[PDB]
Amino acid sequence: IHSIQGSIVSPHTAATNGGYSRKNDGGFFST
Amino acid sequence: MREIVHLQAGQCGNQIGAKFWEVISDEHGIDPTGTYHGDSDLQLERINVYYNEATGGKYVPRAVLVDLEPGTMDSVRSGPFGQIFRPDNFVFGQSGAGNNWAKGHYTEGAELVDSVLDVVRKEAESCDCLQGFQLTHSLGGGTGSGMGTLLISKIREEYPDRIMNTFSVVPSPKVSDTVVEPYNATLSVHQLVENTDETYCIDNEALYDICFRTLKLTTPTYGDLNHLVSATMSGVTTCLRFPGQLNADLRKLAVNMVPFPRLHFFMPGFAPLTSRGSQQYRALTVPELTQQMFDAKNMMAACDPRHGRYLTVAAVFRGRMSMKEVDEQMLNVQNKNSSYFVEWIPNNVKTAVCDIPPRGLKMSATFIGNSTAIQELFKRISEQFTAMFRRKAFLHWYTGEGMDEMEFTEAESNMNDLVSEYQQYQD
Amino acid sequence: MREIVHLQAGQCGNQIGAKFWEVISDEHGIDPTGTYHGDSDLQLERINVYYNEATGGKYVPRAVLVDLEPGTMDSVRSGPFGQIFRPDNFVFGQSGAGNNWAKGHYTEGAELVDSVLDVVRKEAESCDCLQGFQLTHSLGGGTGSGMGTLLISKIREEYPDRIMNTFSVVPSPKVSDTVVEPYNATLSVHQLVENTDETYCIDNEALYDICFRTLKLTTPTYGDLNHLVSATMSGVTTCLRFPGQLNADLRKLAVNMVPFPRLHFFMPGFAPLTSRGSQQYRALTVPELTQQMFDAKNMMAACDPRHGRYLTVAAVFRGRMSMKEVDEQMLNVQNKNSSYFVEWIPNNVKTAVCDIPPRGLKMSATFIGNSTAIQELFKRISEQFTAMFRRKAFLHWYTGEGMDEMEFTEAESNMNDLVSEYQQYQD
Amino acid sequence: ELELQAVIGFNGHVPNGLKCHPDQEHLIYPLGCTVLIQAINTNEQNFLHGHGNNVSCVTISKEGDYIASGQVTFMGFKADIILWDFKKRELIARLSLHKGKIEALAFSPNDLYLVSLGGPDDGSVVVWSIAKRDAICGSPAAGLNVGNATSVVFSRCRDEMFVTAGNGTIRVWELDLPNRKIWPTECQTGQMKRIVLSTGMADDDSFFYLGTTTGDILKMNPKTKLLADTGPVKDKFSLGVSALRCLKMGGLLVGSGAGLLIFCKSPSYKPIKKVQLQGGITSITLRGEGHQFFVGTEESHIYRVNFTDFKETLIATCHFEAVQDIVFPFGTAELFATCAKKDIRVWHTMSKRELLRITVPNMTCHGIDFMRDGKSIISAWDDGKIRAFAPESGRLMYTINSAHRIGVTAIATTSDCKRIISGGGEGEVRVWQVGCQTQKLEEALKEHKSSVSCIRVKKNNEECVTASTDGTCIIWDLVRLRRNQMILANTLFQCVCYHPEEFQIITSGTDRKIAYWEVFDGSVIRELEGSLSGSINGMDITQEGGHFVTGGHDHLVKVWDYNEGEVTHVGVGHSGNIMAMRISPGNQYIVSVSADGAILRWKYPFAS
Amino acid sequence: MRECISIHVGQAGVQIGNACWELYCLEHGIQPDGQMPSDKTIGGGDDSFNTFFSETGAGKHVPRAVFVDLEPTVVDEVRTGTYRQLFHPEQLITGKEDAANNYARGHYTIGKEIVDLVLDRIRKLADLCTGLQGFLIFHSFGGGTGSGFASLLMERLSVDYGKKSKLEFAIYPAPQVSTAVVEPYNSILTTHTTLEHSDCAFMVDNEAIYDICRRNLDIERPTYTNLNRLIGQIVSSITASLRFDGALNVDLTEFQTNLVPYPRIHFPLATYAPVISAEKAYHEQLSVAEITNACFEPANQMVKCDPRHGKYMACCMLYRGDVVPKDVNAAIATIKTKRTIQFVDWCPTGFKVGINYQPPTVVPGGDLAKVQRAVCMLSNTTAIAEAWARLDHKFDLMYAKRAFVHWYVGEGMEEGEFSEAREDLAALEKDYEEVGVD
Ligand SMILES: Nc1nc2c(ncn2[C@@H]2O[C@H](COP(=O)(O)OP(=O)(O)OP(=O)(O)O)[C@@H](O)[C@H]2O)c(=O)[nH]1
């Protein structure tokens, strides 16, 4: 279940990208 | 990103905040519990300016409500959106200040500032880069004024690089109910003029007037008044949260408004208000919209600047619109009364354009003026203060609290400074 | 392999270790009867940190409980997990403790040392290769102190090569109930500082503070207190038994913690503190988790370190983490208050990442700190000792026990030595 | 209203949920937000509904004329108790006074009044008068210094006495009729502090017993209100004693959470009869007098036992998890297969009879499909693997090992039975050649960058389309091995289906819409709103364009017309969010499967 | 013929190892059974694996490396993992105690009884290997256990076999991040113990790794998955020389010689230009000019030592894929004409180049692009010395107050070594300035 290394869940729905992270302050950053 | 944290001071602020917030939420289409129902992609994008996020699609907001009487806030909790409001933010006192601005200002606050500062610094570090924050209360609000003074005083040196909105409703000139209100008003404003940058002037009597004019529904609620003013504040905030051809920055708006540090006070003005037949008796055209906008009857914030003069004007329009109409309409008014403005700087206008319409109507606007329309108000406060301090009535309580009349002396000197500066700048 | 064997003394430790084992068994997924239900392969593998397999799929605790009054362990046996432990494991006394330090230190212990030494060496040979042992008791426990002194003293010359973890709880500063509690605490600590290496600090009053703040179910139990403190202790123990990118060794941590042999006492820092609505009102994220961790209210140990400065700090995150967020959060605290740390040595942060989350939650954390907040506590106890010995109150009991006055001299002298050393560094 | 014919499932997570009617002919249980009554012999099904949420608790009147039910709702909200007429199968009454949840219901012995136990935050008992449609009274159940109570039970000779128990709390009451008031009395238990799992009252009311959380048995005299005797001197049973049952003469039936079904006595509680079963025991009850009787597991297994020989019969079961997908053999409406956690199950439709099970150690499924010949079955596992199994033996033909690395979510096998098209969680789509002996990497297509949800291969065996968790769909050149065209939307595309002429494609992503897109050039055909609450997890379109079906979080299966584009039939009762649609060839039934593990063969309303 | 042995210490190194063997099994398409498919590859160990694995007639590849570990959890996990059948049981040398970050704990307490074991592993690899050109050391300066065992084993292999090569790789002290303050202690211990024997050390920093990651790889939350992916890609790029053939062939010995102007300093930096996301590669283009620009871009170095504060002495570039020497020398001539890049007067030439035809393929579960032209860059400059200045001013204050030294003196040392290391340092800096200056 947890002993898996394939990805890390973003705490928010990146579909909306609620935690808007910018491309080092330059654009989009989720996936 | 850049964000704002909301502040809810004084018992008026308590209700006005719940109203404003349900206005925001109903604009944003979330159910009261918080499980939103996707309709609006744009606000879906831009929600993070004003809400934070939880698990399972819940949009936890960012504000602090402060007061002393638990019943008011439990009534708020029983209000339609207590489930959206946070016990984390439910900070309060176990008593009352007796509406004694000084009791709050030195005694009661001394032990609640701790918790409120903890909460606000938690919020500040949780967020990354505020534009700043806004405050909602009454200048005549005893607890509101007392707490607001201290909190603004602290937060200035805390973060001196941020925006500090003050929405404070002005008590009725005709009746004050609370008669120590002139005391509290001058006391607060003495430090307010030093501290704040943007202040809103709002008057219950003028709200009653508009009720008689277009609302016309005989029996309104202070809640409906809250509806109106919350609509105004929503209008002034939407520019940040929305697309549209306009620089939304309230700092840019402020620097538009300020050649001078001492111009702190501002008179909001909203856009269409309607009767029950004029929905279908009114044709939505920008010309009549703006003609309605600039009206002494439309003037609701402080009073008619008719006897005064128009210093600076900033009009924002909301909904789809074209540049041509706004340009020509400003030329129209510029030339209709070029005399009625001030020659110091021509073209005292800045206009803003949000393309996104409101919900329930298509074309709307807001307008904020800083004109010569507060001389009446502070000259009134002057006569009241002078008459009071000929004999110093009710002052023994404030002595027992431990202050002195000398504070009142510098306050009245400060407001005389305000008198002279306003008058000398206008004439 | 490398394992630990536990010491449970003192009438508080009686409840504490019971809560401890029930918590760890809840973690490890075994029925109260001992027949393990295969759910977690890794914990099945690494149960040998604590438990020793018997016949028929049951693993015996490597814990030794000691006390003097039968009814204590009898109620323990009446507890839901008394069956887990052995009548082989139940060493005890044949008399009344009297809650007298010297009574527990000289007469009664003189003939139970043999039994306890035999049992502990029994378990020592039973296990193969050891890091050390941990003890659970109270410094305010008049029998836990009396027995722990002797047993630690003897195991010292037994094996000076292992890690001698100590977990004693502090009586209430506002009310000690036991009026000779200063006598007890001084007597214990004077040689405990000589002996031990690692020590934990807990204040019941601070626990009550926490309960008022966030628990809000009105009426807790000291059992609930045990639930929380056992949660913290279990969490700090989890490192060894679990995989993941963390160097679990308590020695790996202690070498980091101790630049100077005189440093022994350490305060905890825990992870989410939840209330009625915060569950659904909370998005479990590392940033806010770090914020909460470094918060005076969340620090639960003794009193406010706000008065002073931090020497060394060690954080462990449990669950699904990454190096980057924890590193940047350490940077964020470093930037926010480089002042509040010590110029003496930079970068006093020691970090661990346990991969296996606990049950009922996803993200958790623990923190152990060495800073200047015990100062008020021990200066309190010092002035208490002065005020009680000045007129030698309640002395005849200890005289008849066989004590004289001379030892108190170097007892309080060692206390003041520690006082002067701590202040000599931190200022 | 879309009409149902067959139902498969039971909420194996309700302690003491299964009930037996006094007729000795109706076996009754809650099914999510639906309540089901079952003919023991003729297996006819009877559903009632109207529940605002999934049903939590239930009880039958001694006459078996009245059914008390109660659901679980969200925090800060009231839950619903519904009284039902049995012979009428009709909603007598609804009440909503407690908040949070309701966990214990109780008919008075003479069916005079009702007892309801509210949620832990509610924490109150309330008695209601059937004669006059109102609560008699209520009170916070326990004293302030105790944990939460668990289960209530009336007396067996008085409607004015009853007991409840829980976290170290044990109380009995007296119904003070003239004052309409409650009188509590907590019991003494010496130093045994325990928490109750199961409760039972003596028919003669001489005593009453409880299985604790620790797997001990408590014997209790009510009149003295004194502890009588305890459980097994030694050898308690792991995972406590979840359920219980007394016997008319004496002796107790005990079910442990360890799936240990026993009968024992008292003076010794020594195990008289033992069988170990499959699924922690959640309910036990007696058919009339209990010479034959039934038990229900956490694994949602149903066993019928005659006490005489003490052997069991698993007579019903279902997937206890989120059934990730279902599929049918091609052209027929006689059987199908269902993926879920721990297993796959092939079932026969009209008998609802599980034809075959697959023991799958330590696994959750995501994707499945048949093969066209009725000889091979292909799967898609969250461990990044694939498997192939025989059609009527269910034996592992092959395990494609590390077929993916972040799991396998979306599967498809070609009608020609030669190629496998797969979309995964990393964003890959691999097509591979197959055989009975060897399977090798055709290629690992790498275009998507999140999880993939659904696949649809064109009947020409030349194109393919896929819905995934990034907002992108790709129609693909199966032959040239390159994207044909792209469909990006303000959604996270989850379910997709073609057009029979293949000139349209119908989709529902996360945008709560149904979309028709034209394959020719890339211009949208039509938009409509699909789910009034949530997304549409499954769609299925008629082979000839008459209709289609959409369903999901809205718990409504919605047959829409295709030549009209309008909601033609809606079916409800699905408590789990409805996960997948499957069309019986022959135009006979839809099979709707929901995340609760409810499988529903809804009958064909229109004409076939 | 052409092969090398690798050594891997500490739970620091264990996961990075396991990852890089995953990488090797990928590029060879190795199967977890232990044998290749129906393709004809098996022998006595003379093919693409001949340098890497040891596939005897049994058909089972045996990689040419050793893991020494002291913390059983990780080694048991990998023993329970996927490739344990590939892995010979006891070459996973496992210990039962941990060095508590103490270089000397790992250097005296447990090492003696384990270094003999490791030596036997060495000699039993030595008999079977033929060319064994050198040794690839995977350790860490912030070694909780990677420090002391690495030091003493290097001592023993230096004294026994001084004719061959040993190539060293650690994680460096972060300029500002410290998970330990025993870190300067043991880092400097290892450095000064290695100064007189260590051959050539190449250094990496996962801060800068993440910096590049969120710089262009779009991943806000990578892990050692990606970390080890990239560092193993670097070492794979350097060993492609052995694996395939190319336009020209270069060897570790030439790396040493042409990378040592003068002794003491053997601590250059690597930088890999063509790092990009899959989609950005999809809709952009790659060429030697911009990859050269990036590889000499100041932030693209995986160490935050400023090039425009430093002066360069040695530079080596190696490409994989399809290019022409015409444009290659064109780009290098443009760089020579460029004024920002500053070699010293002492060397007119400062470049050594290598080329391979083989394009490194893509890895399943990877994150990079689909490369057709790649380049790795190993260069030694003067800018690194600030990384030692920071350590020395960090170290002098704490040594002047004698913090945590009580542990070491109790478990059997003194401060004479700590003294020695300080002027060893001072010598290394002063030499760095004396060679940077003209
Ligand atoms: N919320 C609310 N406030 C009102 C209403 N009508 C008048 N007010 C005024 O709003 C003022 C602001 O309230 P607060 O800022 O909370 O004042 P305070 O510090 O609590 O002291 P008080 O002015 O005595 O209430 C009050 O002084 C009232 O005079 C109303 O209908 N609702």
Ligand SMILES: Nc1nc2c(ncn2[C@@H]2O[C@H](COP(=O)(O)OP(=O)(O)OP(=O)(O)O)[C@@H](O)[C@H]2O)c(=O)[nH]1
């Ligand atoms: N177990 C338990 N201990 C408590 C509780 N409240 C306070 N304590 C304190 O924990 C202390 C430690 O107990 P012991 O070390 O066994 O004390 P002692 O030497 O046996 O004698 P006394 O401390 O005087 O009872 C006691 O002194 C109590 O004062 C509680 O609720 N439960």
Ligand SMILES: Nc1nc2c(ncn2[C@@H]2O[C@H](COP(=O)(O)OP(=O)(O)OP(=O)(O)O)[C@@H](O)[C@H]2O)c(=O)[nH]1
């Ligand atoms: N090489 C490596 N370093 C890591 C890894 N994860 C974190 N690090 C950093 O590298 C350091 C690892 O060195 P050590 O902790 O001394 O490892 P060790 O010497 O084998 O002994 P331990 O204390 O048991 O780990 C840590 O301090 C981290 O800062 C990893 O997976 N591999």
